[PDB]
Nucleic acid binder design. Structure first.
Lengths: 100, 148, 175, 258
RNA sequence: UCUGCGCAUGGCUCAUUACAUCAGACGUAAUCUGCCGCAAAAAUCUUGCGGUCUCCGCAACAUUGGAUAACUUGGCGAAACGCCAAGCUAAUACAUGAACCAACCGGAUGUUCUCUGUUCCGGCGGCAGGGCAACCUGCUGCCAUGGGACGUCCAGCGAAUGAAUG
RNA sequence: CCGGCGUCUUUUGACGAACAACUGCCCUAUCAGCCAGCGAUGGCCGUGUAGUGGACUGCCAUGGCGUUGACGGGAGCGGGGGAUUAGGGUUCGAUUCCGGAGAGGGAGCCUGAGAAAUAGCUACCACUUCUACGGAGGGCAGCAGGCGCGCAAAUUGCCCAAUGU
């Protein structure tokens, strides 16, 4: 598995770039993972509190991605395929997809 | 060419930035200063150019005659209060304000500072004419066109 | 922040201005850019005109010009000999307008040798031409003294003109 | 940046009232200045009366039924200053705005081939890139390739049918000339003399027909024609002659007895 | 929901404040300026197919590429105009890129050949002799106030510097 | 085959922004000297800014202002204008229009052509609101309305039909 993200028991995200086994307050721009993209005016930063990259016992949830797959299947994940929501809307992609 | 060290005392040199005068030629030799390269500029409101500017040597970047400094809206007159400071004089205008209630005038003077071109050097009590130029120091906005 | 104003300053009467207004963003200093020698690094800043101006840091090359013949070539900036403003500046080899400097001088040499169809053009250009002595001695050795006549701190390009006799003779004697 | 205007601070050459409303329209920037212009909505509503309300003026203009300079406009607010031909093809009428005597905007009605004529005063001339000369006007129009005889403060006859410039007219000598601004508006006369004061405004002395000389600034001169019998364009309701206060009052009474 | 535009205007309040602020007149040749108006625009080696070495030959409404939200799925937190992972997929968002079409204007030129200067004051190249290796002498070829033909390189707008013009 | 929109860059009129100056402005001398270490006045070279400039660095010079009241203090947003007067004047201007400044007190900042914006952001201070106390917020001198205050001042109403944006 590769680790990805997850949160504190106060909902506050983990940040890969921040290094702490603790929570600190930092300036967080819109495009960062501590503050949503679509809130506020163009060109802004706020002060949000959040957690570092280093794990401890304060984690409620941890999100991963499978990279290598074991010999023991785990339900709802490696036993299940879910199709794409939408097919391509670009012309040239239809030509790569059906190979026509 | 060659240096004139009468002008120079600076650690930066001084040159005229309008026109190159630093070219070597034998055309600046056997002449007082007349054959030497200069920049000259007319002031077209009836202020006749001096001889000194045209044929001179002097390097100043804060007079309209040897620089791109320009003469604009206001033109005033005033005497000489003092000649003190280097290339800066002190002019005193005097006029009359009127008061309606007493139907009688009063004398009120503006003591003002000006940048006097090194061409001119008027004595105390002389009358000066002064134009409207871009800022040149904190207080100085004027320049000396002519002297009476 | 930093401001450019007469409203924190004493008057001609020795009195003090009194305020009633918080400072504008129209009036606005910024910290000076330090152009030196070393690898070129250029950090833009956005300005009030809706355009960018470029902060020269550490320019080691300039576009230099030889007077009188109406030419120019690039060459490498090596040293700063002199400056009007301070001695301190010169020692750190900061580049700011009206510093005398030192350049590679190589392209100028090359050029001047080019200054059968070709061959007779040379002989015509050799005629009615001469050069100052103090110039040519230096130009032989492969070093020269020049001045930087563009401000590098707000364009991030350092351009200069090469000293000629009248002015050269002054800066020389100051060393 | 200003985006609001109040009725009082707006011109009363637009003939707004003190009461009724609080705001007046601030037009989008264009050929003409804020004081000398008159906005579309004002014209259509308060004068022509093809609209009774603001919203009705949007209805007409956004749609498009109205042209100025012969170009159709989808603009709600646009300036209309001086020597502008406006044409509503639905009515089939061609107005040419001017300055009437007594400081009033004139709306004068023209033959159809006159509405392709226009007169623009030149402000500056300058050479632009490629050595291409340019006359820049008081309506902001750029005349490429003007005649080599062009000078500041001269008029250029301007075809709106297809864009170019035929022969000019100069401000030189005595010529039939009219005033813009300065409260001698719409008054027409010959140039008697042109005084010079360098570094300051250049006075000119005009003499209208049936004498009565006067003085107005060079800046406020706008040429009409070579002569009064060589004029290219129409005059407003009064010919460019003012009358004494007494005579105004007299005539007002005489007509009121009908 | 992404994208574009506006939200700095209107509205409200007089605390600071006397060479301040404001009013009349005046300048910005000392500068910026979205929207609006009249206008301007000739740099650009690209695309597709076939063979084929990353190379050529043809063809020419130019036939361009890659993600991200809503959404879906797992969710977190006492609450929060607080937030996380994975999977999706758009463009007048973002990133690329236009040969031919193509006018006109010059300079640098080339070890390209064609007229040429019916002479010698100069230069250059080669060979021989002597040499203090600095240099001299003799002989041969080419060029000298010139224009054609052919080849090569730089050339646009905006900005920087020097020089000439204005 | 043609039409209408949309956009890049360049160019200059317009709408504005930002500076500077000529002239004018209440009381007080029991406020008469004021200004320069750390810029006061000017010159010289640079730096910075969209730009001019002691705006700022370095170097050099010793100036600048004052009984025609500088400097300091008190009262006060400025003007158009209001009241009263035969005339001359006297007095008012918080307030509809224009100009400036401010958004609890201060400072700093981003974005944008334009802001040092505050129903934008960051910090401190004085207050102040939620929280299973781990944290998270608030800024009415916008309209109503409430508390306080003082001799003293309106409805938690209806509408975008009009006038503008």
């Amino acid at each position: 598995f590769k680790l990805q993200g997850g949160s504190d028991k106060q909902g506050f995200p983990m940040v890969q770039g921040v290094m702490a086994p603790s929570r600190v307050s930092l300036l967080v721009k819109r495009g960062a993972v501590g503050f949503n993209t679509f809130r506020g005016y163009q060109g802004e930063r706020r002060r949000k509190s959040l957690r570092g990259c280093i794990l401890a016992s304060d984690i409620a949830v941890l999100n991963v991605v499978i990279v290598k797959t074991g010999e023991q299947p785990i339900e709802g994940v490696t036993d299940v395929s879910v199709p794409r929501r939408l097919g391509p809307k670009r012309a040239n992609k239809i030509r790569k997809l059906f190979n026509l | 060419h060659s240096v004139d060290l009468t002008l120079q005392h600076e650690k930066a040199y001084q040159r005229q930035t309008a026109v190159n005068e630093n070219s070597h030629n034998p055309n600046k030799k056997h002449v007082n200063m007349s054959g030497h390269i200069r920049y000259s500029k007319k002031i077209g409101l009836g202020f006749k150019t001096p001889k000194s500017a045209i044929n001179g040597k002097y390097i100043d970047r804060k007079c309209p005659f040897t620089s791109d400094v320009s003469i604009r809206g206001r033109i005033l007159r005033g005497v000489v209060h003092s000649t003190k400071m280097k290339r800066s004089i002190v002019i005193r205008r005097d006029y009359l304000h009127f008061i309606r209630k007493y139907q009688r005038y009063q004398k009120r003077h503006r003591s003002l500072t000006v940048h006097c071109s090194p061409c001119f050097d008027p004595k105390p009590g002389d009358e000066v004419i002064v134009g409207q130029c871009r800022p040149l120091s904190k207080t100085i906005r004027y320049n000396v066109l002519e002297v009476v | 922040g930093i401001v450019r104003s007469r409203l924190h300053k004493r008057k001609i009467t020795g009195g003090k201005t009194k305020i009633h207004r918080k400072r504008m963003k129209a009036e606005l200093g910024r910290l000076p850019a330090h152009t030196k020698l070393g690898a070129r690094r250029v950090s833009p800043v956005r300005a009030r005109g809706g355009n960018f101006k470029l902060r020269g840091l550490r320019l080691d090359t300039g576009n230099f010009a030889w007077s009188t013949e109406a030419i120019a070539q690039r060459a490498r900036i090596l040293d700063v000999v002199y400056n009007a403003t301070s001695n301190e500046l010169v020692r750190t080899k900061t580049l700011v307008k009206n510093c005398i400097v030192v350049v590679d001088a190589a392209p100028f040499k090359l050029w001047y040798a080019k200054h059968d169809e070709l061959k007779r053009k040379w002989m015509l250009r050799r005629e009615n031409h001469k050069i100052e002595k103090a110039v040519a001695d230096q130009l032989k050795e492969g070093r020269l003294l020049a001045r930087i006549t563009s401000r590098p701190g707000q364009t991030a390009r350092a351009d200069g003109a090469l000293l000629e006799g009248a002015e050269l003779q002054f800066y020389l004697k100051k060393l | 940046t200003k985006k609001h205007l109040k009725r009082l601070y707006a011109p009363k050459d637009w003939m707004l009232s003190k009461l009724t409303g609080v705001f007046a329209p601030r037009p989008r920037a264009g050929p003409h200045k804020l004081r000398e212009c008159m906005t579309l909505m004002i014209i259509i509503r308060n004068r022509l009366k093809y609209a009774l309300n603001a919203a009705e003026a949007q209805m007409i203009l956004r749609q498009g039924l109205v042209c100025v300079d012969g170009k159709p406009r989808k603009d709600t607010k646009y300036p209309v200053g001086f020597m502008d031909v406006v044409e509503i093809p639905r009515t089939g009428d061609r107005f040419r705005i001017l300055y009437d005597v007594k400081g009033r905007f004139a709306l004068v009605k023209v033959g159809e081939a006159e509405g392709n004529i226009k007169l623009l005063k030149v402000e500056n001339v300058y050479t632009s890139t490629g050595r291409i000369p340019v006359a820049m006007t008081h309506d902001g129009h750029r005349i490429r390739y003007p005649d080599p005889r062009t000078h500041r403060g001269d008029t250029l006859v301007y075809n709106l049918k297809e864009k170019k410039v035929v022969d000019l007219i100069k401000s030189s000598n005595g010529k039939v000339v009219m005033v813009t601004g300065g409260a001698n508006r719409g008054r027409i006369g010959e140039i008697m003399s042109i005084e010079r004061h360098p570094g300051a405004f250049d006075i000119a002395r005009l003499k209208d027909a049936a004498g009565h000389e006067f003085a107005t600034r060079a800046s406020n001169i706008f040429v009409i024609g070579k002569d009064m019998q060589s004029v290219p364009v129409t005059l407003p309701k009064q010919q460019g002659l003012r009358i004494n206060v007494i005579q105004e009052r007299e005539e007002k009474l005489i007509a009121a007895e009908a």
